[PDB]
mmCIF file of N, CA and C in Angstrom:
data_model
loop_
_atom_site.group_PDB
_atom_site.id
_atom_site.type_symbol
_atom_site.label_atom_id
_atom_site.label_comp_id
_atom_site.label_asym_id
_atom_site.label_seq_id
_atom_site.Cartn_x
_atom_site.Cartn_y
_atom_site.Cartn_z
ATOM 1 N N UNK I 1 0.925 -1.152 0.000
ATOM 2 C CA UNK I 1 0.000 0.000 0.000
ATOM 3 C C UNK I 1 0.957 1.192 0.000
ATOM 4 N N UNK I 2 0.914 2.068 -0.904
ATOM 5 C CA UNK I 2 1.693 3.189 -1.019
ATOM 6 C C UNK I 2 1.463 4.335 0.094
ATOM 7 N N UNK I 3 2.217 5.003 0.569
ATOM 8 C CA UNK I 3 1.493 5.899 1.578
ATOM 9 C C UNK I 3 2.823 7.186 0.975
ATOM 10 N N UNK I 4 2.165 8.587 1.433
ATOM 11 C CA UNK I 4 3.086 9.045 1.086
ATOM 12 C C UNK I 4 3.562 9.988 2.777
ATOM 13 N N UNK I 5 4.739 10.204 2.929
ATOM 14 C CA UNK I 5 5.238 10.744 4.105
ATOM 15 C C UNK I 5 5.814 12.876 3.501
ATOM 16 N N UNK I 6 5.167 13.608 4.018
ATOM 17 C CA UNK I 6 5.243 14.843 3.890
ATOM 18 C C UNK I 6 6.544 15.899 5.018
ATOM 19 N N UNK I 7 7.725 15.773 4.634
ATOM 20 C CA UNK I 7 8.513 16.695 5.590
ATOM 21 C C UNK I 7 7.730 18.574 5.560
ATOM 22 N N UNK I 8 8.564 18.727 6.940
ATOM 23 C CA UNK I 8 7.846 20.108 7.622
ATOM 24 C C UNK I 8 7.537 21.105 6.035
ATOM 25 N N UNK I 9 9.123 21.380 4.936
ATOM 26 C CA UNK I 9 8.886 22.072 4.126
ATOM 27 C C UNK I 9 8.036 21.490 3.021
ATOM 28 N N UNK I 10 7.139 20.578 3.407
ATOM 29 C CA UNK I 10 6.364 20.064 1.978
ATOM 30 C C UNK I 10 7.199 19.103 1.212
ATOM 31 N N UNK I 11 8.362 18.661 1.217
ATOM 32 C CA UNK I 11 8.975 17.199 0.334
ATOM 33 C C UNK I 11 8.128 15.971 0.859
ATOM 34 N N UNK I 12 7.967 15.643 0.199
ATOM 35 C CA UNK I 12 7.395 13.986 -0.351
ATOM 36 C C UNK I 12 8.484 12.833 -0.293
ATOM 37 N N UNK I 13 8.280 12.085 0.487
ATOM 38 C CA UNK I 13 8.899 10.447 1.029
ATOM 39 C C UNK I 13 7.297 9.746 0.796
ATOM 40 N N UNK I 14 7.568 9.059 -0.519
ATOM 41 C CA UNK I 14 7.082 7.825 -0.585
ATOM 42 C C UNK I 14 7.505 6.134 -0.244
ATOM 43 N N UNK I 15 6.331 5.766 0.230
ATOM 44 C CA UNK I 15 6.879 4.479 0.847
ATOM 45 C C UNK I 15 5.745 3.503 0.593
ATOM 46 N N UNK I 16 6.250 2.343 0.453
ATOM 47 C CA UNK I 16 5.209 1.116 0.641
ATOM 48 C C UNK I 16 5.222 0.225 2.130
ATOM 49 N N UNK I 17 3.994 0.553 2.313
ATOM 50 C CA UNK I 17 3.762 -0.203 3.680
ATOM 51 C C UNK I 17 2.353 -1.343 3.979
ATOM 52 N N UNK I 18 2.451 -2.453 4.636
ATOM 53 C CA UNK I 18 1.444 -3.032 4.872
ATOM 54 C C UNK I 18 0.546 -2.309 5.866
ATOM 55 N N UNK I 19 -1.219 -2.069 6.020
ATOM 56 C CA UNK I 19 -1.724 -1.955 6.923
ATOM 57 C C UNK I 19 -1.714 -2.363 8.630
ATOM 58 N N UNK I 20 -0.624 -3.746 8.086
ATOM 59 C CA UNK I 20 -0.720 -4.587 9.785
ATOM 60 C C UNK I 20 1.290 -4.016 10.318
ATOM 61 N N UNK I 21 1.784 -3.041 9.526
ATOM 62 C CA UNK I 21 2.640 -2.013 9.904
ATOM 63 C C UNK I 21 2.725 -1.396 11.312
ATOM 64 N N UNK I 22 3.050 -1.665 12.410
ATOM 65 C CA UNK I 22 3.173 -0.695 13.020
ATOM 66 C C UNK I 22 3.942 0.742 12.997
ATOM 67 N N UNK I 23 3.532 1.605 13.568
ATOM 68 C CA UNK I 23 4.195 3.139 13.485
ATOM 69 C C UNK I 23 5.714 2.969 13.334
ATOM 70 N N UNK I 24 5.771 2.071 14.448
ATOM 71 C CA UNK I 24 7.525 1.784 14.657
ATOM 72 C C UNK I 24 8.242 1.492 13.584
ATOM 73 N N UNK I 25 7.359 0.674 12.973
ATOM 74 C CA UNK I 25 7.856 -0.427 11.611
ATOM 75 C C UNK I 25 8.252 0.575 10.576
ATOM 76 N N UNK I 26 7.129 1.459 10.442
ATOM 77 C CA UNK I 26 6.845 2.808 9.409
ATOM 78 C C UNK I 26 8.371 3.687 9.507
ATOM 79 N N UNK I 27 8.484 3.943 10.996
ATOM 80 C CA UNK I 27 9.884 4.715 11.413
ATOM 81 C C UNK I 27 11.204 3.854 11.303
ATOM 82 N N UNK I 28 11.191 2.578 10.936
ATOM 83 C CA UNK I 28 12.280 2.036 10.737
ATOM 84 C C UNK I 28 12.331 2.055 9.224
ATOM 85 N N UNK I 29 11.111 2.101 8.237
ATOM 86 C CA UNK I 29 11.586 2.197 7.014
ATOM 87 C C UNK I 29 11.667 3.479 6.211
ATOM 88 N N UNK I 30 11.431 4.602 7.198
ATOM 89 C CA UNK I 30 12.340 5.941 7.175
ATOM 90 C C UNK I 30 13.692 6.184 7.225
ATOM 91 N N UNK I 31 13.665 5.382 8.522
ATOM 92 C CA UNK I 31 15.523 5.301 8.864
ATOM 93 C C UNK I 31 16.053 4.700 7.656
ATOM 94 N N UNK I 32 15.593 3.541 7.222
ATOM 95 C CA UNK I 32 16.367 3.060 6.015
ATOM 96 C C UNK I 32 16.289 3.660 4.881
ATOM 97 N N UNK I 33 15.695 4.445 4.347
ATOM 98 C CA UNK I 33 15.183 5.114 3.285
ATOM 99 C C UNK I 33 15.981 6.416 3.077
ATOM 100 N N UNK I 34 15.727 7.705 4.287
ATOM 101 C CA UNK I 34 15.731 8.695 4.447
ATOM 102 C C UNK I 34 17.326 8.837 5.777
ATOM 103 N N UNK I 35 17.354 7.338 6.731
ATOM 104 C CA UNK I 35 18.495 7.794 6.966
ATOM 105 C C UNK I 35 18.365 8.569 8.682
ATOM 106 N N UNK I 36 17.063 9.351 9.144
ATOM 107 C CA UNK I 36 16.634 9.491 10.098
ATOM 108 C C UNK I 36 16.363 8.750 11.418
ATOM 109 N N UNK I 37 16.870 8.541 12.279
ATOM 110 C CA UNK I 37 16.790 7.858 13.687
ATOM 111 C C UNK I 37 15.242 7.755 14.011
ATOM 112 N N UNK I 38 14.916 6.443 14.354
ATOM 113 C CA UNK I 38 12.971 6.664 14.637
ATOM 114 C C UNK I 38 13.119 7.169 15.792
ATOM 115 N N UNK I 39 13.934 7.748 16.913
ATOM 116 C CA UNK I 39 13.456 8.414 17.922
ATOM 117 C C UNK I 39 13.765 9.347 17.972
ATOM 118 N N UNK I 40 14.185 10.373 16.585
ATOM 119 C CA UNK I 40 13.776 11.664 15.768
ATOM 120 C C UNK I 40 12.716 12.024 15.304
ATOM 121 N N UNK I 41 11.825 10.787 15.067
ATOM 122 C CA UNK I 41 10.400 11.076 14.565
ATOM 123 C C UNK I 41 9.549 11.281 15.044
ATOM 124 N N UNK I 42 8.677 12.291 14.668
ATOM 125 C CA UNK I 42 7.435 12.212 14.823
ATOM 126 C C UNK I 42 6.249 12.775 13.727
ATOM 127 N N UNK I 43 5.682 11.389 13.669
ATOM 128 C CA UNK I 43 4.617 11.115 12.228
ATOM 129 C C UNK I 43 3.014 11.785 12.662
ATOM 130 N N UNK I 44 3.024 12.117 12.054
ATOM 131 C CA UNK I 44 1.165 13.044 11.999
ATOM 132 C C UNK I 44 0.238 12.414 11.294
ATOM 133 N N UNK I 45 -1.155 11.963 11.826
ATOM 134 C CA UNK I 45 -2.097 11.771 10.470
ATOM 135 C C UNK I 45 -3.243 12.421 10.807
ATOM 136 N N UNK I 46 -3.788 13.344 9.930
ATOM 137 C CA UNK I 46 -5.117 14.235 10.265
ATOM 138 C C UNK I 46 -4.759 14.890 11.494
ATOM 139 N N UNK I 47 -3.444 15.831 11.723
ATOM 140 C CA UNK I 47 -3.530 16.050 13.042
ATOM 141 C C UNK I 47 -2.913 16.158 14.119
ATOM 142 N N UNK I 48 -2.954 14.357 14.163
ATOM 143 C CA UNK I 48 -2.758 13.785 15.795
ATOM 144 C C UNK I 48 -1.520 12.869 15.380
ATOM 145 N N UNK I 49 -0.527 12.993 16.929
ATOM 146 C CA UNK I 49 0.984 12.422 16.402
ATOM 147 C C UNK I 49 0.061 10.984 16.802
ATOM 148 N N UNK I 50 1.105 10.087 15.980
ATOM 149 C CA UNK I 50 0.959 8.375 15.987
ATOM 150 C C UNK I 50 1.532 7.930 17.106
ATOM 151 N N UNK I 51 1.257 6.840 17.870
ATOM 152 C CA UNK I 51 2.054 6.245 18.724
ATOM 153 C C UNK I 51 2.739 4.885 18.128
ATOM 154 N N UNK I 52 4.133 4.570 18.858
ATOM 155 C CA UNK I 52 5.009 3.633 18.001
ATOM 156 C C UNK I 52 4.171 2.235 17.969
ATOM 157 N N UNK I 53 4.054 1.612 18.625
ATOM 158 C CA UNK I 53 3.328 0.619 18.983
ATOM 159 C C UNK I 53 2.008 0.122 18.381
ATOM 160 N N UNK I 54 1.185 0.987 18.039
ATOM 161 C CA UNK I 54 -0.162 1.082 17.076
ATOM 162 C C UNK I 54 0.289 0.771 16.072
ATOM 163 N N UNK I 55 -0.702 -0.592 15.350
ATOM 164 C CA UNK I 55 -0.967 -0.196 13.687
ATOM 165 C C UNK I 55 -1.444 0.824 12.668
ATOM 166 N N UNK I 56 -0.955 0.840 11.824
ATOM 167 C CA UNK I 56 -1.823 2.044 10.461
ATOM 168 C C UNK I 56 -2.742 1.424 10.583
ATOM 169 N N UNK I 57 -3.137 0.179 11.046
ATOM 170 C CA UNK I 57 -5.139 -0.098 11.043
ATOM 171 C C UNK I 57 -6.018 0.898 11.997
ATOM 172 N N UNK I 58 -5.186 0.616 13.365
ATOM 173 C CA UNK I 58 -5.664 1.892 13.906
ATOM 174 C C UNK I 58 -6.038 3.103 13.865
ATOM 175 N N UNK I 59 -5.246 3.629 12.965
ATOM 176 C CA UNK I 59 -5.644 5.086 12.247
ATOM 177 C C UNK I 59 -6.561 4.976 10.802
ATOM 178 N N UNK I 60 -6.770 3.744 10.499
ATOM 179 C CA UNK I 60 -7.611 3.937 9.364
ATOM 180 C C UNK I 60 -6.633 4.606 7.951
ATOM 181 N N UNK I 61 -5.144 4.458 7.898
ATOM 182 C CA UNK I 61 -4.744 5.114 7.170
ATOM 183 C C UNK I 61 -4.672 4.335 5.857
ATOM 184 N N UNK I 62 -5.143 4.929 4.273
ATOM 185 C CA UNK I 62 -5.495 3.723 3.276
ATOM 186 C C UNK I 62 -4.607 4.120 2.171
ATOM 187 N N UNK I 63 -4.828 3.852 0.936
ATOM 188 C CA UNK I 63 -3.701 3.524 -0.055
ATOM 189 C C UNK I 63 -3.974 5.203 -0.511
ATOM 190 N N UNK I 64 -3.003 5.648 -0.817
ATOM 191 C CA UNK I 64 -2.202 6.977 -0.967
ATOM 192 C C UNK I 64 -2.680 8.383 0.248
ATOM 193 N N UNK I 65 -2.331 7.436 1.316
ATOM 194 C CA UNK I 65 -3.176 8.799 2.538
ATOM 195 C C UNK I 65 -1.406 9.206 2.915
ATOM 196 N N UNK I 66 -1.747 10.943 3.334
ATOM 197 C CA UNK I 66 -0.374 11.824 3.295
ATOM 198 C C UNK I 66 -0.327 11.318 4.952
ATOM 199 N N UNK I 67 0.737 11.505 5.584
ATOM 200 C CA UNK I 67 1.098 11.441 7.165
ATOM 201 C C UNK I 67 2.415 12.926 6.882
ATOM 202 N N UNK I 68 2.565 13.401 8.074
ATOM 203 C CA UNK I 68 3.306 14.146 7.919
ATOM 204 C C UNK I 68 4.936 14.097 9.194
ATOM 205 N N UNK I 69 5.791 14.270 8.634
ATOM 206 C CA UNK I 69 7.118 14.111 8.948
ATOM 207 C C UNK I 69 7.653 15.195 10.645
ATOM 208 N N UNK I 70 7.531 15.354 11.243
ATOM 209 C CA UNK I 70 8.931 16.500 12.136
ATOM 210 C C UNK I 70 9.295 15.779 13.068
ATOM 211 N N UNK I 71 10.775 16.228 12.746
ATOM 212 C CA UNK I 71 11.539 15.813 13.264
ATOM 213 C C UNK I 71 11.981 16.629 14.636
ATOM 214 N N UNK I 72 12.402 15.924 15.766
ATOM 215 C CA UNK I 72 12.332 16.463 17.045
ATOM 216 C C UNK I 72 13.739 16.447 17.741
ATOM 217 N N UNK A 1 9.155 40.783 19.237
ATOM 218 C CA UNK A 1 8.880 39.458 18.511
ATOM 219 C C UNK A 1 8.588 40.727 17.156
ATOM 220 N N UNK A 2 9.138 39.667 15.682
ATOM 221 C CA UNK A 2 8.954 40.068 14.979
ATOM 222 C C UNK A 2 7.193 40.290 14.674
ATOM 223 N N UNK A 3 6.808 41.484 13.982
ATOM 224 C CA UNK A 3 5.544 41.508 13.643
ATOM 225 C C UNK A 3 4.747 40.550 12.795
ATOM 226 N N UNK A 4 3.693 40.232 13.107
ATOM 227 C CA UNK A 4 2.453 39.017 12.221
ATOM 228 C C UNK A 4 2.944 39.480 10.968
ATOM 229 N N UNK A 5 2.731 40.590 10.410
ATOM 230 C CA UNK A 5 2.390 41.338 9.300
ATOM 231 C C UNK A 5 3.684 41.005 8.264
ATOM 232 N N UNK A 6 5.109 40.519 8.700
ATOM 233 C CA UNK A 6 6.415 40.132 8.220
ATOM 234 C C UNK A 6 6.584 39.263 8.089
ATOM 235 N N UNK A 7 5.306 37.722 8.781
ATOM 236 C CA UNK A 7 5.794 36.709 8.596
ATOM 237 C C UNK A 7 5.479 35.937 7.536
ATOM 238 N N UNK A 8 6.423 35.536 6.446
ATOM 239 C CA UNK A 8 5.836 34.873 5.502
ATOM 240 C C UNK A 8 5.110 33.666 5.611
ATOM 241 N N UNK A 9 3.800 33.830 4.697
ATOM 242 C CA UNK A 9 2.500 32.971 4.775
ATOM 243 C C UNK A 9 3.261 31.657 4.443
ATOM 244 N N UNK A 10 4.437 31.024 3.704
ATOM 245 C CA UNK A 10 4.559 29.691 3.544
ATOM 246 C C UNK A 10 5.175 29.418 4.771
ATOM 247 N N UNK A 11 5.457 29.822 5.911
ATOM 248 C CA UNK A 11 5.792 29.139 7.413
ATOM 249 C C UNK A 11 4.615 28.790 7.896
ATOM 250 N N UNK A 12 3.484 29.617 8.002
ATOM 251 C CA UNK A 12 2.266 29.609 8.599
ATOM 252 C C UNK A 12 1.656 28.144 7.848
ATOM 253 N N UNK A 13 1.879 28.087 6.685
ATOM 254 C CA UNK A 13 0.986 27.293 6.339
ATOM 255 C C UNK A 13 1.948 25.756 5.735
ATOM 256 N N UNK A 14 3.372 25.939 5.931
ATOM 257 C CA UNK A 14 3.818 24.366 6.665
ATOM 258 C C UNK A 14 3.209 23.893 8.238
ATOM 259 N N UNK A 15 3.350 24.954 8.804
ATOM 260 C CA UNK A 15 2.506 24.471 10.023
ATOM 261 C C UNK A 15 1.336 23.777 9.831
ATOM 262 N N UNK A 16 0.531 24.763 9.433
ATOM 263 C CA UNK A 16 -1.583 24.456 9.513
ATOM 264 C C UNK A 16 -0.652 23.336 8.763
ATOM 265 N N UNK A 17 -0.642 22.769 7.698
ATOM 266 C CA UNK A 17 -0.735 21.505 6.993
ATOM 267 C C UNK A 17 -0.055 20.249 8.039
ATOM 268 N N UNK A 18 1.139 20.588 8.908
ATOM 269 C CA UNK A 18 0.968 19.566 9.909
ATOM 270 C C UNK A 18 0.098 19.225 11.033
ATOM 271 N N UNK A 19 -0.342 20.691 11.571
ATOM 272 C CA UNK A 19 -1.202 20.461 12.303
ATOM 273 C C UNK A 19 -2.610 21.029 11.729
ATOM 274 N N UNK A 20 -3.594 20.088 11.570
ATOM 275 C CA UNK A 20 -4.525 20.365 10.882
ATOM 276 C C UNK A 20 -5.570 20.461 12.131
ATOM 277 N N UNK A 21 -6.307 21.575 12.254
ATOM 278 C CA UNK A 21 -7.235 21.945 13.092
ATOM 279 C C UNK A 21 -6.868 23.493 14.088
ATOM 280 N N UNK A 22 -5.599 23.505 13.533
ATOM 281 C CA UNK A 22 -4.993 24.752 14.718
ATOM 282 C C UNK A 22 -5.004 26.155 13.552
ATOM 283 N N UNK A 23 -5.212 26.965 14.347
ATOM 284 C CA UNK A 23 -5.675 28.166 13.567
ATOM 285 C C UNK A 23 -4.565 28.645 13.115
ATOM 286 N N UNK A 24 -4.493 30.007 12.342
ATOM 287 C CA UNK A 24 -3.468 30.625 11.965
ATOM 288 C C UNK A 24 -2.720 31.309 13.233
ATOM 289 N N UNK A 25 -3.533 32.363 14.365
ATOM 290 C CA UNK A 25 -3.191 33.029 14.683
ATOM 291 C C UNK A 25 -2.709 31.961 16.026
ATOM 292 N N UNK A 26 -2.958 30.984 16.361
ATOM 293 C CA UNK A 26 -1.780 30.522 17.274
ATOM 294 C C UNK A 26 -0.673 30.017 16.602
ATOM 295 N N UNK A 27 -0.465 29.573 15.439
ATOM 296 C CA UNK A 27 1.080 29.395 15.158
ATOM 297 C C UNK A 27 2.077 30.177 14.657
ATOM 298 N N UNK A 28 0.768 32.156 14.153
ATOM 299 C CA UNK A 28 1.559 33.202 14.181
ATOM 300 C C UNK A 28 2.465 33.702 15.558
ATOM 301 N N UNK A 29 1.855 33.012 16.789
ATOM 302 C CA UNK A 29 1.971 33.479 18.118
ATOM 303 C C UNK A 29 3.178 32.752 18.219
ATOM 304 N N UNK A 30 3.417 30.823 18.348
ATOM 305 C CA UNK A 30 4.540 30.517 18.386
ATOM 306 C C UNK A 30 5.006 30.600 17.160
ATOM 307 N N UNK A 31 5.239 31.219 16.270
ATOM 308 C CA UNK A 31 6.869 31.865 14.923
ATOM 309 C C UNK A 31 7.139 32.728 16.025
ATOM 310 N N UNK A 32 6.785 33.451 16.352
ATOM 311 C CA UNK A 32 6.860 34.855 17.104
ATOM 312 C C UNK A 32 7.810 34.568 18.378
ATOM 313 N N UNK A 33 7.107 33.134 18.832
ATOM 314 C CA UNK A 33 7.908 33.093 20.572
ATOM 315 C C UNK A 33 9.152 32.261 19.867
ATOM 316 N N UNK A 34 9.304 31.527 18.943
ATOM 317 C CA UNK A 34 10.325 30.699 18.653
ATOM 318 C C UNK A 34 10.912 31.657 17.396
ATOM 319 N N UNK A 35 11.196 32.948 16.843
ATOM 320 C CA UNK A 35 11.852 33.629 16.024
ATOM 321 C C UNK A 35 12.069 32.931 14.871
ATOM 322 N N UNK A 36 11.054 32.498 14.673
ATOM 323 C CA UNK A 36 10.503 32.469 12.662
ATOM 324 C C UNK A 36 11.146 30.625 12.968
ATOM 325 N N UNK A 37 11.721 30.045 13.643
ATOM 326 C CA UNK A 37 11.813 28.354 13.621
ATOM 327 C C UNK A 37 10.590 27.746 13.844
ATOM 328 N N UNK A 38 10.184 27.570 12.247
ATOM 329 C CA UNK A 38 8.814 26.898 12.358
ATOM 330 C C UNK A 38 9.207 25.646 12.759
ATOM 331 N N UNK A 39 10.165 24.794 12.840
ATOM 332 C CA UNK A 39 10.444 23.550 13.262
ATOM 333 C C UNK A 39 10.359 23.192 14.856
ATOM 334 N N UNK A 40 10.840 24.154 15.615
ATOM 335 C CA UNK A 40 10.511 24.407 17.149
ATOM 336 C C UNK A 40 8.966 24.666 17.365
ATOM 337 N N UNK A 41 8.337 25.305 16.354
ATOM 338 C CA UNK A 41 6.750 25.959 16.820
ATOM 339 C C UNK A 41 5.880 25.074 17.086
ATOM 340 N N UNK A 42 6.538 23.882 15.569
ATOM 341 C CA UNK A 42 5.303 22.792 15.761
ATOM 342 C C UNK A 42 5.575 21.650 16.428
ATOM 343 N N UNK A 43 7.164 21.742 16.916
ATOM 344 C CA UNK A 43 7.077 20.811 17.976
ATOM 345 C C UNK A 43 6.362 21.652 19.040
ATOM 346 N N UNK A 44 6.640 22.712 19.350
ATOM 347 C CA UNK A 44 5.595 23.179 21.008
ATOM 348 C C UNK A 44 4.619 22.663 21.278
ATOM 349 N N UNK A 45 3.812 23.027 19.983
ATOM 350 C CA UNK A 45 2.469 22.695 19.404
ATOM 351 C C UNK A 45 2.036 21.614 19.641
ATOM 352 N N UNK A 46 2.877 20.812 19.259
ATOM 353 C CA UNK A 46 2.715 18.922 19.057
ATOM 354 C C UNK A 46 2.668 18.484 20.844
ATOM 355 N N UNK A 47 3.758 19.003 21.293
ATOM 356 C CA UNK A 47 3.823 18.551 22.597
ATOM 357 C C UNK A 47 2.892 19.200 23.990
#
């Protein structure tokens, strides 16, 4: 499932992820991707930061939904 | 604190797009307390 990840200035990190993904999982295939430490992250959807531990089922997040990136 | 009126609208509105539901004029308030580091504002924000 494609999702796309949005940094603070608006760049685009696309990624493929399964729904049964946890957040954590999501932040480890940042780190590999992008290179970022997951306990630099913090991911947004509609909002509200994600917790590591939760699935993207939890949030209802579906094939091309934006999450957004800052780093802390 | 620098004036609202100086701050350019694409800081304001990297913010609103991370945080979706928060108005303009509180994340004009933290640019203002954090000197234009929108990266500090929306962590405040967040936390």
């Amino acid at each position: 499932m494609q999702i796309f990840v949005k940094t603070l200035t608006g760049k685009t990190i696309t990624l493929e992820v399964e729904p049964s993904d946890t957040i954590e999982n999501v932040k480890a295939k940042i780190q590999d991707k992008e290179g970022i430490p997951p306990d630099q992250q913090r991911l947004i959807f509609a909002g509200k930061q994600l917790e590591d531990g939760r699935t993207l089922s939890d949030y209802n997040i579906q094939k091309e939904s934006t999450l957004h990136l800052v780093l802390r | 604190s620098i004036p609202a009126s100086v701050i350019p609208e694409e800081l304001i509105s990297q913010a609103q797009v991370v945080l979706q539901g928060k108005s303009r004029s509180v994340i004009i308030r933290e640019l203002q307390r954090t000197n234009l580091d929108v990266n500090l504002a929306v962590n405040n924000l967040l936390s």
